[PDB]
Design a protein around this ligand. Structure first.
Ligand SMILES: [Zn+2]
Lengths: 77, 232, 351
């Protein structure tokens, strides 16, 4: 919510944990997989009928949009 | 996401479950795709949007099943393509972008005719019927000339591919009315009904005295182009 | 065999890397344009002129009884010779739509009249395809042949998007080589026929073909499935018997590793293959000359007109046959900021 960096967050966390810690914020690594609930590709589901023309794997997250464009420079780049 | 209701068990309409309380604020604007490309080059934009359009189309058909409340529950959907500025709407619905003899995305009256009558009109433009008119443009089943065919399809040249809801935008209608009143204020500061054809120098001068007036009173310096706040 | 840098006086953003050049009855007509037909010219086809290095692009128009065509991207072209009943024809099918998509439709083009001020009127006609029609594809090759003694059309090559059952969102933009079964077409009626070849076990694209005395020769032959550019030329020969159009094929030992070539007919059969790409990044610098007889292909080289370090170092390029020893090529230009006239033009000449 406030645009902090990784190193930013680690410095802040390490600091506030040093003094009066009693660790409060959470370390970086734990968030690095704690977020996986809020990203796409986590929750089970399906469709009846099944969708047309869509690979029905429900766990893929971020995908490059090119959709496997054959890199052949012969064709359109 | 805008709204969600329930149709079960039937015998009624959809009982409104939850309607969003402030969808305008970007705090609810979920991104789905980004392309380091320009708006206008149809080729690239289409060749990347393709799968998105395809699966949104296939989406109206099937119904969804999710684990929710600990239970397997079903879903149906209704999609609305509304939040597109004019240029894109007309570009993707196969219009002549943009200020050509056909203006309204809904009523197919000409430009000059839109000055004779202003209020009495029907909304007709629809996706599938635009596909029909484009098929007519292609096949040319009546062997008419350029302008006669232009009229018979009421100006549909390009094949649309992304279906869009028959509506206008809120924001940039606001900005258009704002800049229209801006121009007419620059005009009436001077004389227009008294001056048949003014010159550029007098136009910029009436602008300058309008800006000085907006600065002395209302505390408004001009900007390059009037955004939503300056419009309000 | 010398080049000349041109400059498009204006209108330098309506050309796209893939496009077609058709010289018919004098002037040259460019087909295919970036974006749908602008209202400047709802035709979608431009007349071209080359005056003192200046590149000038005029607007054209069709008849009233003519069809209006989408600006296909990289279709197949056939210059159907001037004869009865309608001389002369240009057969196009079917390219890729600027709204990214394919059209298995087939268009026939001719000229109508002039001027009245040297302006040129054109005519387009679709043809229903009674088939056995080849599904929509691109990069294929259409050619005309004249066998005992009637005129027919040979269609072969090209790839296409995924089979419709395998149309997958994340494999959507991918494209596989269309299966290698040639197609014979009568211009009238539009009865299309499929034919198999037990020697052509694989599809291919961008392979410039040539036709002469109802015999066809395929040079080039880049393929996706094997990442190969088999130089081996492919000859085939057809005899148009009613109603069994008998067909035969044969391998040639040697052709050339050319990909998406530019073919200039200079004589009746003195052809020069100009350029393309010899390898996956190595573009083809040299020129090549082919004499075309009933003896067959006869191969030689010429001098490659010295490419200015701009083009000789440019990653990619392309062009078209202005015809008669003259051709045009384009270069993707850089800039900071972009001009955005990002295409330079070299007019190249033979002799
Ligand atoms: Zn209207």
């Amino acid at each position: 919510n406030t645009f902090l960096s990784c190193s930013q967050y680690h410095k802040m966390y390490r600091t506030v944990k040093a003094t009066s810690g009693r660790q409060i914020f959470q370390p970086l690594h734990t968030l690095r997989n704690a977020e996986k609930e809020l990203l796409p590709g986590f929750h089970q589901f399906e469709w009846q009928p099944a969708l047309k023309n869509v690979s029905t794997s429900w766990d893929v997250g971020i995908i490059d949009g090119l959709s496997g464009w054959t890199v052949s420079v012969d064709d359109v780049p | 996401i805008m709204s969600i209701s329930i149709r079960l068990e039937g015998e009624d309409d959809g009982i409104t479950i939850f309607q969003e309380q402030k969808p305008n604020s970007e705090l609810s604007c979920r991104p789905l795709c980004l392309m380091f490309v320009d708006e206008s080059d149809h080729e690239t934009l289409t060749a990347i949007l393709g799968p998105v359009v395809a699966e949104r189309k296939a989406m109206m058909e099937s119904r969804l099943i999710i684990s929710v409340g600990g239970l397997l529950r079903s879903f149906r959907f209704f999609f609305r393509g509304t939040g597109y500025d004019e240029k894109m709407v007309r570009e993707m619905e196969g219009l002549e972008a943009s200020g050509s003899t056909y203006i309204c995305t809904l009523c197919d009256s000409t430009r000059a005719e839109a000055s004779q009558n202003m209020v009495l009109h029907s909304i007709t433009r629809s996706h599938d019927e635009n596909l029909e008119r484009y098929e007519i443009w292609r096949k040319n089943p009546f062997s008419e000339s350029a302008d006669e065919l232009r009229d018979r399809v009421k100006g549909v040249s390009a094949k649309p591919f992304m279906e869009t809801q028959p509506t206008l935008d809120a924001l940039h209608c606001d900005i258009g009315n704002a800049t229209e009143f801006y121009k007419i204020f620059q005009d009436e500061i001077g004389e227009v009904y008294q001056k048949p054809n003014p010159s550029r120098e007098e136009r910029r001068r009436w602008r300058s005295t309008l800006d000085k007036q907006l600065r002395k009173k209302m505390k408004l310096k001009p900007v390059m182009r009037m955004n939503g706040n300056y419009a309000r | 065999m010398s080049l000349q840098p041109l400059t498009a006086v204006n209108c330098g953003s309506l050309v796209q890397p893939g496009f077609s050049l058709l010289d018919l009855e004098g002037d040259v007509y460019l087909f295919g344009q970036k974006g749908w037909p602008k209202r400047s010219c709802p035709t979608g086809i431009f007349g071209v002129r080359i005056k003192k290095g200046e590149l000038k692009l005029r607007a054209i128009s069709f008849s009233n009884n003519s069809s209006y065509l989408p600006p296909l991207r990289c279709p197949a072209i056939a210059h159907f010779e001037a004869q009865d009943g309608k001389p002369e024809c240009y057969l196009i099918h079917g390219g890729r739509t600027p709204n990214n998509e394919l059209s298995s439709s087939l268009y026939m083009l001719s000229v109508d009249s002039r001027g009245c001020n040297r302006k040129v009127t054109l005519r387009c006609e679709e043809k229903e395809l009674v088939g056995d029609v080849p599904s929509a594809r691109y990069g294929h090759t259409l050619s005309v042949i004249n066998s005992r003694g009637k005129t027919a059309c040979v269609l072969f090559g090209g790839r296409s998007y995924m089979p419709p059952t395998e149309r997958t969102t994340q494999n959507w933009n991918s494209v596989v080589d269309c299966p290698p079964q040639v197609y014979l077409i009568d211009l009238e009626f539009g009865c299309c026929t499929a034919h198999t070849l037990p020697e052509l076990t694989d599809g291919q694209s961008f392979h410039v073909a040539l036709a002469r005395q109802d015999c066809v020769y395929f040079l080039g032959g880049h393929i996706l499935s094997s990442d190969c550019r088999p130089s081996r030329l492919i000859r085939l020969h057809v005899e148009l018997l009613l109603g069994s159009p008998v067909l035969t094929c044969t391998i040639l030992h040697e052709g050339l590793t050319i990909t998406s070539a530019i073919a200039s007919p200079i004589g009746y059969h003195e052809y020069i293959i100009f350029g393309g790409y010899q390898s996956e990044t190595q573009k083809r610098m040299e020129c090549t000359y082919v004499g075309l007889d009933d003896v067959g292909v006869h191969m030689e080289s010429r001098e490659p007109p010295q490419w200015t370090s701009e083009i000789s170092h440019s990653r990619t390029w392309f062009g078209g046959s202005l015809g008669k020893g003259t051709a045009l090529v384009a270069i993707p230009s850089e800039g900071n900021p972009t001009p955005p006239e990002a295409y330079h033009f070299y007019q190249v000449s033979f002799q």
